[PDB]
Paper text:
A high-resolution crystal structure of LDTGo reveals unique features when compared to LD3,3-transpeptidases, including a proline-rich region that appears to limit substrate access, and a cavity accommodating both glycan chain and peptide stem from donor muropeptides. LDTGo contains an elongated and unstructured proline-rich N-proximal region, spanning until residue 86, which we will refer to as the “belt” for reasons we explain below. In the crystal structure, the capping loop is disordered and the L247-252 presents a conformation in which the Phe251 traps Arg266 from the active site through a cation-π interaction. Another distinctive feature of LDTGo is the presence of a long loop connecting β3 and β4, Lβ3-β4, that includes a unique triad of in-tandem Tyr residues (Tyr180, Tyr181 and Tyr182). In addition, in YcbBEc, there is a narrow groove that extends toward the catalytic Cys residue, whereas in LDTGo, a large and open cavity is observed near the donor site with a pronounced acidic character.
In contrast with the strict specificity of typical LD- and DD-transpeptidases, LDTGo can use non-terminal amino acid moieties for crosslinking.
Residue numbers in the entry: 54 to 200, 216 to 331
Write the structure that this text describes.
């Protein structure tokens, strides 16, 4: 069977004239040397190994695929890498279904930290979408919410309907969700979502506490009480925090498949 769909409510940040800060009041994102960045990435990698269920470093061939396709995608999206920063790379291929944290460096080869199984969107089921490839940024344009378990809201995105071989797109609210009583952790590693990205509950808490993709969220929390209120009070944000979630597809690109029971 396929688990029921997650709820993916939009969380666009309302405009507030009273919170508009001058440039000096918005802190700059931390910039560390490549030497410091690599040491911090190694520390975080060891912590994830011992605190996130299902964590793995990958084989050399798999690491190369994560690193090459993620760099390819960021380059094609013309998104700049001007400081050492983490990137969450998700391989939606039906045969992989894993994420890899990568350290992007502006003037040196990127480095792989490791990651966990995930579940992205499945084919063959009406109203379930294939998770789209591309570069998705976690910005202060959205708040996300807490289920509490953190939910990251990546905005409306064009996605391919998973049940129509003719290739027909629609709009999904792309979000990152932990596992829960209706989407159990043993589902991870095979496609089973309606289009969202499911991650282990412990990976969700780790990302929340260390702020791995929350660089722009933390920046906004400096002056905006709505972002401050959603972030954990006991967090310990890493200086190499990033903001990009990059969905790749390494094998033959996912093709939709008919749902034999759809009318
Ligand atoms: Cl389940
Ligand atoms: Na998918």
């Amino acid at each position: 069977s396929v688990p029921p769909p997650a709820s993916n409510p939009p969380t666009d940040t309302p405009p507030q004239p009273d919170l508009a800060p001058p440039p000096i009041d918005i802190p700059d994102l931390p910039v560390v040397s490549d030497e410091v960045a690599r040491e911090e990435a190694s520390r975080l990698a060891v912590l994830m190994k011992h605190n996130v269920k299902g964590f793995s470093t990958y084989t050399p061939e798999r690491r190369k695929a994560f690193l090459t396709l993620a760099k390819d995608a960021v380059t094609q999206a013309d998104m700049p890498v001007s400081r050492p920063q983490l990137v969450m790379v998700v391989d939606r291929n039906e045969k992989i279904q894993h994420l890899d944290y990568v350290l992007a460096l502006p003037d040196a080869p990127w480095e792989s930290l490791g990651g966990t199984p995930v579940s992205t969107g499945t084919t063959g089921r009406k109203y379930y979408y294939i998770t789209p490839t591309g570069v998705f940024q976690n910005t202060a344009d959205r708040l996300g919410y807490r289920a509490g378990s953190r939910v990251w809201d990546m905005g409306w995105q064009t996605a391919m309907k998973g049940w129509l071989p003719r290739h027909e797109t629609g709009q999904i609210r792309l979000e990152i969700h932990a596992t829960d009583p209706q989407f159990l952790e043993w589902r991870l590693g095979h496609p089973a979502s309606e289009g969202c990205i499911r991650i282990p509950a412990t990976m969700n808490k780790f990302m929340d506490h260390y702020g791995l993709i929350d660089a722009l969220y933390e920046q906004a929390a400096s002056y905006d009480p709505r972002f401050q209120a959603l972030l954990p009070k006991d967090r310990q944000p890493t200086q190499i925090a990033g903001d990009l979630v990059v969905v790749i597809d390494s094998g033959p690109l996912t093709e939709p498949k008919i749902d034999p029971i759809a009318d």
